[PDB]
Each structure stands twice: as C-alpha cells, then as structure tokens.
A paper describes a structure:
The apparently 53-kDa tumor suppressor and TF [name] is the most frequently mutated protein in human cancer. As a master TF for stress responses, [name] regulates a complex array of genes that can determine diverse cellular outcomes such as growth arrest or death. The ASPP (apoptosis stimulating protein of [name]) family of transcription cofactors represent well-recognized promoter-specific regulators of [name] (14, 29), and exemplars to explore further mechanisms of TF selectivity in general. The [name] DBD has an immunoglobulin (Ig)-like β-sandwich scaffold that presents the so-termed loop–sheet–helix (LSH) motif to fit snugly in the major groove of a DNA double helix and the L3 loop to contact the adjacent minor groove as well as the DNA backbone, and a [name] tetramer recognizes the full RE.
For crystallographic analysis we used a [name] construct that includes the PRD and DBD (residues 62 to 292) and a C-terminal [name] construct (residues 625 to 828). X-ray diffraction data were collected from microcrystals using a synchrotron light source and processed to 4.25-Å resolution, allowing structure determination of the complex by molecular replacement. Our final model includes [name] residues 91 to 291 with a coordinated zinc2+ ion and [name] residues 657 to 823; the crystallographic asymmetric unit contains 1 such complex. Here, [name] almost exclusively uses a relatively flat surface of its ankyrin stack (composed of residues exposed on the second α-helix of each ankyrin repeat) to interact with the LSH motif of [name], prizing the L1 loop away from its contacts with the S2 β-strand and the H2 α-helix. [name] F818, situated in the C-terminal loop (tail) that is trapped between the ankyrin repeats and the SH3 domain provides an auxiliary hydrophobic shield for the interface. Our structural and mutational data suggest that [name] H115 is a key residue mediating the [name]–[name] interaction. Overall, [name] engages [name] on the edge of the DNA-binding site, and does not seem to clash directly with [name]-bound DNA. However, the [name] L1 loop is displaced by [name] such that K120 at its tip is no longer able to make contacts with the base at the second position of a quarter site. In contrast to the displaced L1 loop, the other [name] DNA-binding modules remain well suited to interact with DNA in the [name] complex. However, the [name]–[name] structure is distinct from the published [name]–ASPP2 complex. A recent crystal structure determination showed that the HPV oncoprotein E6, in complex with an E6-associated protein (E6AP) peptide, interacts with the N-terminal arm and the LSH motif of [name] DBD. This HPV E6-binding site substantially overlaps where [name] binds in our [name]–[name] structure, and there is considerable steric hindrance between [name] and E6AP-bound E6 when the complexes are superimposed, based on [name].
Residue numbers in the entry:
A (entry chain A): 91 to 291
B (entry chain B): 657 to 823
Write the structure that this text describes.
C-alpha cells in the first residue's frame, strides 16, 4: 500500500464554537462493552460494538456543518502508514451496504453517512452531517464502530492508533478538532483497568 | 439493605469492575453512606483499589467525605497491610491537592447548600465553582470561592473534582 505524504493534525482545537468531546460507556451490566479512560485519553472498545462519542459545543455551528473521523498511527515511525482493515476483515462478510470494506471506522444509525478515500493523502475517513442536540440533551452523540482489532496481523498489528474528530463547514474548512487514543480489544474494561494500573508505576 | 449497603457498595469490595462501571454510568449515587457512614469511595480505598477510586472520583466522589465511626476520609482508610497501598494513597493524596488547582481551580458541588451566614456562598448540586483561596491556614475546612460573580466561603466536603452523573 502507498504511504501518505503527510500526517493529519491531532491538535486539540475548540475553535469559535467551543468544540470538545465527551464519552459514554456501553457496557451492558456485567458485559464491559466500550469504556473511556479520562486519565489516559483513551477509548477501549470491542470490535463492531457501539462506541458513543459526544460532541459538545458552546454555541451552534451553521447548518451544513459536518463531522469527520479519521484514524492515524500514534507512533511517529508509523504515522505515514494509512490505517486500514486487515486482509481477513476486509474480505469478511460484515458489510452494512454503505461502508468501504477497507475502512476501520464506521458510523451506525445514520443514512447520510459518507466515506472518503483521499486521492492525495490516501487516508480513510468517515463524515456525517452535524445535527444539534435533541430537546433536553446537552450534546450530539455519534455512534462509531471499529471494525478491526488492535492485534490484527496485517492491519494495526498491535500498534496504537488515535482517532481525530474534526468539525468542518459545508466546504470542508476546519471549525474545530479533538482526538483520543483507541484500543480495539476483546475485553475493554480489563484492558483499561490494566493500563491505568501500569501508568501509576 | 439493613446495613445501609447499596448495590454499588457490594460490587466495589468484590472487585467486580464491570458491575461498578455500569452502575456509575447509570447514575448510582457515588456518595451513598452505609450505616457506618462509609461511602463507595471509602470501600474502594480500604481495598486499595486505585482503578475504582479513579472511576468514582471522575464521577462525583466526595474526596473529603468522612465516615461516622472514626471520622476518617477515604485517603485515611487505605490499608498498608494489603498490596497496592502506596499507589492508592498517592493517587488520593494527589487528588486532594489537585482540587482548587487543576481544571482552572474549578470544583463541582455535590449537594445543594443554603448559606448560614452572609459571608458564605449558596449553591445547588451540579454547579461549577472556582476556588480562589485554597490553602488558607486559618481555615482548613473552607475555601474562598466564586459562583456567578459572587465570592464567599464554601465547605470543602461539598465538592468533587468532577460532577455527579445525572439520570
Ligand atoms: Zn483486522
């Protein structure tokens, strides 16, 4: 696969609208599904499970605003390498009819989802229209799915990734940016628990 | 139950992380005291369970809450006879010091409060308050604070480093 000639920013940027993120936990009681660590700024999630990400703004951006998600490798030496699904997952029969088979990140529950293979950078991304929060809600929630395990050989192969969330106008111009690390694993709760223990050392 | 024990309390001592997270996210009262005045944070500390302590602190735990029995705080309940004591005590000690300093000095009210004196500040549960003067030596139990332009003293034990979970 061709390497990218550039690396997208992961610089936190609240912008004029005071854009930041919030997170939820999907864990169905005993089953630890997707958990976020504030201390680590890191999401631990299971493959293909719902990963809620909240958009919080101080004031409402204009209609036509869009929200884009993109993964990059966290380590400097791997940053130019395009994050994509492994051969196994790319070929498996898990299509929703909308997402490219190679894409790591999908959005569920939105028929206006749009996917991009960048002609210039080669990077994959997923974009949806920004919608203001529902009545009685303080934030907009997007449900992401991650379709490959961190451990997949031929894919991420145990290399850490970041997800970069950008807010853009209808033309693609930047309004705000935030990011968080992601580990896709079989037991997100245990792995989070474990990584925080090790950090305290 | 008869002992003041709630569902959250049971999950903590048993180190059943999955149930605890679920209950916290669901809005389980992270400060409910048992018959002895032990809050979920007190139980987590006595087990030296740093991971749970963090989850509680990050979801509205009262750092300065005290038990009925020995009047001790969670920090003081850490067990040096069990493993993980150093890590947990250090975390809680750092948590205590970070209040009124980190997050731009902002702290979250965990209870409604009606001032008893004009030189005190009134506030509702969930509101964000900026701590202006922390380490006043003459008063180790109060902080000079600001809420909506108003300045006044507020009780330390009424605040969390993070806000409660609303249901
Ligand atoms: Zn894979």
């Amino acid at each position: 696969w061709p390497l990218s000639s550039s690396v997208p920013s992961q610089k936190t940027y609240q912008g004029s609208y005071g854009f930041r993120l919030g997170f939820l936990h999907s864990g169905t009681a005993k089953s630890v599904t997707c958990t976020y660590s504030p201390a680590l700024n890191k999401m631990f999630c299971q493959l293909a499970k719902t990963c809620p990400v909240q958009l919080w703004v101080d004031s409402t951006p204009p209609p036509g605003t869009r929200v884009r998600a993109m993964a990059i490798y966290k380590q400097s030496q791997h940053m130019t390498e395009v994050v994509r699904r492994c051969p196994h997952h790319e070929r498996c029969s898990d299509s929703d009819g909308l997402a490219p088979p190679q894409h790591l990140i999908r959005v569920e529950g939105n028929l206006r989802v749009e996917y991009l293979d960048d002609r210039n950078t080669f990077r994959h991304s997923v974009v949806v229209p920004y919608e203001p929060p529902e009545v009685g809600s303080d934030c907009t929630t997007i449900h992401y799915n991650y379709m490959c395990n961190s451990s997949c050989m031929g894919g991420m192969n145990r290399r850490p990734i970041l997800t970069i969330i950008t807010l853009e106008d209808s033309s693609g111009n930047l309004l705000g940016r935030n990011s968080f690390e992601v580990r896709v694993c079989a037991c997100p709760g245990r792995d989070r628990r474990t990584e925080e223990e090790n950090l305290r050392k | 139950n008869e002992e003041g024990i709630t569902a959250l309390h049971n999950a903590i001592c048993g180190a059943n992380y999955s149930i605890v997270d679920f209950l916290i996210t669901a809005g389980a009262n992270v400060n409910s005291p048992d018959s002895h005045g032990w809050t979920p944070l007190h139980c987590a500390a006595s087990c030296n369970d740093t991971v749970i302590c963090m989850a509680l602190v990050q979801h509205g735990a009262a750092i300065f809450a005290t038990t009925l029995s020995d009047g001790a705080t969670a920090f003081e309940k850490c067990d040096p006879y069990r493993e993980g004591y150093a890590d947990c005590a250090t975390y809680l000690a750092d948590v205590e010091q970070s209040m009124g300093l980190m997050n731009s000095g902002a702290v979250y009210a965990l209870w409604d409060y009606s001032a008893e004196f004009g030189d005190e500040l009134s506030f509702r549960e969930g509101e964000s308050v900026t701590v202006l003067r922390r380490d006043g030596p003459e008063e180790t139990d109060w902080w000079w604070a600001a809420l909506h332009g108003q300045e006044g003293y507020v009780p330390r034990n009424y605040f969390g480093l993070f806000p409660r979970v609303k249901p």
